[PDB]
Write a protein that binds this DNA or RNA. Structure first.
Lengths: 302, 229, 300, 236
DNA sequence: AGACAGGCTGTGTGAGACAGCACGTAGGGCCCA
DNA sequence: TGGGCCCTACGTGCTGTCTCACACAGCCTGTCT
């Protein structure tokens, strides 16, 4: 008789469990139609993430605030030492493709390129707290805006800026990942070879600094960078080779008849779709200042 | 064994999450008690988005030192504060969405991003260095050399450093340059005499290492930093 | 006309499918597998077979069983043209599921660059490769959707005939799922300093495990083998498990002992972050040149 | 697009089989392939797999009984590696064919032994396969005290190692050049891993100055980046 | 050289097999007596 | 020192999805008049 009594008792708990989970599923601040279809594991994950975020926020001490999300050109992430996106802004789908309820609580080492795990671990570990590095995030959004199945998703490069928070010790890193706009799907433009010699320059270069583009083709640019930004740009070029889309810092570009101009480079590599290997490196440069200290000559070419 | 392992994986997936929630809430109990106490905590905290606008702006200004301008109070802690931008950038501002320019803080650069509705936010982002070719001909000279040796950068370009050095040390300088080229990027420090504009000999140290292309590893030039001691 | 064109399409598929059906029969495969193979798989198997035959023509059975690894063949392009049938014992992926596929489809994305450098053409090779594994600790199989990674110690020589690389991939045993007199175990912290040691260390070199805790290991390494050991430890950090080549590590009263280390990083089941490093140091030789002193530690 | 990539793969496979046949329409190309198959259940035979094993690693096959340790049979592949013949191995044991120090090590036994050249032996219970001074190195700390010198320094500068340990290089350096060595050490400390070269004068055991050029770079910890020591290559 | 039949290619549709989610069932301890 | 209550691991049912081939319509080519 012992076998049949246990089944009724065992079935009793499961019935009580479902209503408790349904109550917990409904307690999550989500639309009612979403909580109904949510399975148990997702309810657990979202509840844990929400509780962690609430614990962090309560340890930290009007219509203009709502405009931040659409104005800011990125989506806010929050990462702990574990590697869990305990909070993602609801506009992640617009830039990254994936949807908030799918991502929140998952491991950040899963939804990024496997070759950025080491950089993620180094940046997450913990004395300056500023962080600025490039992270390749899985993207399910096609170029035409169609949402496409995750099992064949492609990688996307994001420029991450944020701080490490030690909140009473448990540590969270608050990242703002921004997308790098591809130059074919959008100050002067340009284009370079795979081993970084000039191969094309926009005619706007003539007015800014006096350089004639026909002279620039065939010459490596490393003779034009100021000597004080050689290692910075070398690290940026290593990022270019390793990932594909990078952004430079403020560095000096030498003019023709004297001085230098401060420019910022948003350079993206382009792959030949026929054979899937790099062919050319496309750069977009942002000039932000005129010629400074033109009265002196700094280079042999100048 | 495919289906059985998934159930084992899912149960461990659920079991670990059960343990994590209990630690998360201050208030080991049984599973049903854990979920019931969690539901009680949610009911306490329920008074449809994960975070409010105030919390979101707190996160934004903690992650990046930004302020909202169409202004917000967060301008003072960072900026210490067409007329507010650089006079030469007024043409760029008139035509301007994303733009990088300089605003009043001595000028500081401000990175602004936004969309036209214009709503946008502003987020903050004794030695001279010279270049020589493979044989040592001056290619680039920095302003810091005027206080180092007194020679203007123009008078140094096009002339080899060995000619600028003492005749006795010219063989050692040639050997060191050959060594620098051969080592492929290992810095070398060499003590030698540098002549000034007044012909006065000063003891100088040379840190010259070859610069290779990040992709092709081609020797572009040699970066030479010199310290006077 | 169009109906005849439609019938021609059905007619051409009948001969298209019949040749595929009989082509699989000739391949030396089990009949229960050959009849169930689709067109892509049978074409890949035939191409790979023909490539192996072309390579070959241009007590015996105990050779495979004695090895603790599986012989692996790669072309210049990365075709997995041949795998010994004992692959299912280690990775769980059967030979028919692997033969002909590109090696870049069954390798961690960060080992592709090392693969390209090692395949490009000394001829000896020695590298660590993260190949997909479908075995749990209990020996259960699992589909690709949840396959885990395993590090394989790959050794082989590139031969030029068409050029292919013959590899022998071996697993690195997990020290927690395995130690005679000449071999001991030790555990280090993240910063590679001694944190625990086996009781067999004292008779080998004279070290007392009491003061070892907290001291970095890099002091005890010989100065000559610092760069090779640094590269191998960096490989340990990147890939998870390495088998360091022979190196010299100093004793207490003098001399040196050749020691090969199979380091193994340990991850917590809760955080997926590194916790500690376990190294099973194999001492092969005794102290040589005892009368000589080498380092400040040896002076004390 | 998924269907498109299948036919692209299929056409590439069709193209691939076109080249490899010793001797058009897809049906006829498959017919030629299967005709060659008829002219031409494992992909390799025993001898082919043995040849692949021999090519992959410079190893040999040997079997020794565990009861007595006597050698029963060895392969012909031992000679190209160990430069030893089969006749000597036949009629003997394994104990006398290995290093005396490892005689007891193999008694307990996947093990490592030297026969000297290290031989990596792997097998199961016995079937097994056997598989194969003008400058001195030195160490320093941040302040520059000698923490390690290899025995090669005897051939380079004439000093035994005991006479260099504990004494800083600057104190061992010439008083005229004391500042330069300190500057170089500070330089390599702040460069964080960049190899640097400096030429100076070294006082040998017989107290005469001689030219010396070193290559120093700080050993940073691969994980915590803490400076462990400095490796110098002193080339004479 | 233009039209006809045949070969080669691009896209949508149908089905056996398999992965996920969840529940019924029995196997071990839990504190008590 | 007496067996009941209750907690937890496993096989099974149902559902949605994956990948394979089948078939049709369109483009390019050899051949006949």
């Amino acid at each position: 008789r012992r076998k049949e009594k246990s089944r009724d008792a065992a079935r009793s708990r499961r019935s009580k469990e479902s209503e408790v989970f349904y109550e917990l599923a409904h307690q999550l601040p989500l639309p009612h139609n979403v909580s109904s279809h949510l399975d148990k594991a997702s309810v657990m994950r979202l509840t844990i993430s929400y509780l962690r975020v609430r614990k962090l926020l309560d340890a930290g001490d009007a219509q203009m605030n709502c405009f931040y999300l659409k104005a800011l050109d990125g989506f806010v992430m929050v990462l702990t030492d574990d590697g869990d996106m305990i909070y993602i802004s609801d506009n992640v789908n617009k830039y990254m493709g994936l949807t908030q309820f799918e991502l929140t609580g998952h491991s950040v080492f899963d939804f990024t390129h496997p070759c950025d795990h080491e950089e993620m671990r180094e940046m997450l570990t913990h004395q300056n707290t500023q962080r600025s590095f490039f992270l390749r995030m899985k993207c399910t959004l096609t170029s035409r805006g169609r949402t496409m199945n995750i099992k064949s998703a492609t990688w996307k490069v994001l420029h991450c800026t944020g701080h490490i928070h030690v909140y009473d010790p448990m540590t969270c890193l608050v990242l703002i990942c921004e997308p790098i706009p591809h130059p074919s799907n959008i100050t002067f433009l340009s284009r370079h070879s795979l081993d970084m010699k000039f191969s094309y320059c926009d005619e706007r270069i003539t007015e800014l600094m006096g350089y004639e583009p026909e002279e620039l083709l065939g010459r490596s640019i490393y003779e034009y960078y100021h000597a004080l930004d050689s290692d910075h740009l070398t690290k940026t070029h290593h990022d270019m080779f390793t990932k594909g889309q990078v952004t430079t810092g403020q560095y000096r570009m030498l003019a023709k008849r004297g001085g230098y101009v401060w420019v910022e480079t948003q350079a993206t590599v382009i792959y030949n779709t026929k054979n899937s290997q790099p062919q050319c490196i496309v750069c977009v440069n942002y000039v932000v200042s005129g010629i400074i200290q033109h009265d002196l000559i700094f280079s042999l070419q100048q | 064994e495919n289906h059985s392992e998934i159930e084992r994986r899912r149960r461990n997936k659920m079991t670990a999450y059960i343990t994590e929630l209990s630690d998360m809430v201050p208030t080991k109990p049984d599973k049903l008690t854990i979920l019931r106490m969690a539901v009680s905590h949610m009911k306490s905290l329920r008074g449809p988005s994960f975070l409010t606008d105030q919390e979101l702006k707190h996160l934004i200004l903690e992650a990046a030192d930004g302020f909202l301008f169409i202004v917000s109070d967060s301008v003072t802690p960072v900026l210490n504060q067409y007329d507010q931008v650089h006079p030469d950038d007024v043409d760029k501002l008139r035509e301007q969405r994303s733009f990088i320019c300089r605003m009043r803080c001595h000028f500081v650069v401000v990175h602004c991003t936004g969309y036209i509705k214009l709503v946008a936010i502003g987020r903050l982002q004794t030695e001279f260095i010279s270049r020589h070719n493979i044989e040592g001909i001056f290619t680039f000279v920095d302003h810091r050399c005027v206080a180092t040796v007194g020679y203007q950068p123009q008078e140094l370009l096009g002339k080899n450093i060995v000619e600028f050095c003492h005749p006795e040390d010219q063989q050692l300088l040639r050997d060191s340059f050959q060594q620098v080229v051969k080592l492929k990027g290992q810095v070398l420090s060499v003590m030698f005499r540098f002549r000034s504009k007044n012909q006065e000999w000063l003891w100088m140290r040379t840190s010259s290492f070859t610069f290779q292309n990040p992709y092709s590893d081609e020797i572009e030039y040699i970066i030479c930093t010199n310290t006077n001691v």
